[PDB]
Nucleic acid binder design. Structure first.
Lengths: 110, 101
DNA sequence: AAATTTTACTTTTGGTTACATATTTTG
DNA sequence: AAAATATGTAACCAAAAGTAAAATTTC
């Protein structure tokens, strides 16, 4: 259904998005990687899993399509793209979506 | 049966459509395209598939007979054809019908 | 004639590249 | 300290999709 965060609400069902209840279009590629991030609150997503999730392809350290797509999303979702609040970078792993009053997930192991 | 989206009822058997419960003519070609999308909720249809279910032909890589049917269909079903809600486009895959809800 | 497919042009989209900045290593 | 590695993002441009107008068909 609908997911809110900041001034935005995003309808995973229909790919509609609104800022302060005003429609704002998302391209298909933007919905895809935006959804994957949001579908998985607080879960750090590798570029692998993100490329798998959004486009059904395999990724590589060659490519920057994710990072560019992420950049375009931040400029249209983060108040400041420079210091992002919702679409955060986890260094050396990828990107994460953190809701308000939340911190990204840390994994425990054995 | 009838599938309902927006101010529209498309009866898949009776094979006609109503806007606002008003009779709405469709050519066969447009109906064919419609039922293909409508019968597969949220399942993006490639153009390949799209010609099967609707036109009984396979598709070459660069003819665009489907795209123009979609243009014409939105023109008559979308509140705003410019930003469509029921007949959406999926970039590099095809088109999909996202039902109401 | 009506219906529809293909042309021929326009706009959009998303990737790669190129180079700047940032972080962890000591290659 | 450099050096190797990761990330940001602007800009360029091929492929993609919207569509009006012109062909072609319509068993």
């Amino acid at each position: 259904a609908v997911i809110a965060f900041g001034k935005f609400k995003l309808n995973l069902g229909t790919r509609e998005m609104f800022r302060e209840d005003e429609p704002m279009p998302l391209t298909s590629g933007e919905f895809a990687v935006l959804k994957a991030l949001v579908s998985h609150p607080r879960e750090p997503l590798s570029r692998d899993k993100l490329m798998n999730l959004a486009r059904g392809r395999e990724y590589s350290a060659m490519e920057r399509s994710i990072d560019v797509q992420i950049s375009r999303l931040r400029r249209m979702v983060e108040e400041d793209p420079a210091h992002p609040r919702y679409i955060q970078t986890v260094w050396g792993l990828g990107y994460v979506f953190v809701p308000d009053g939340s911190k990204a997930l840390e994994h425990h192991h054995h």
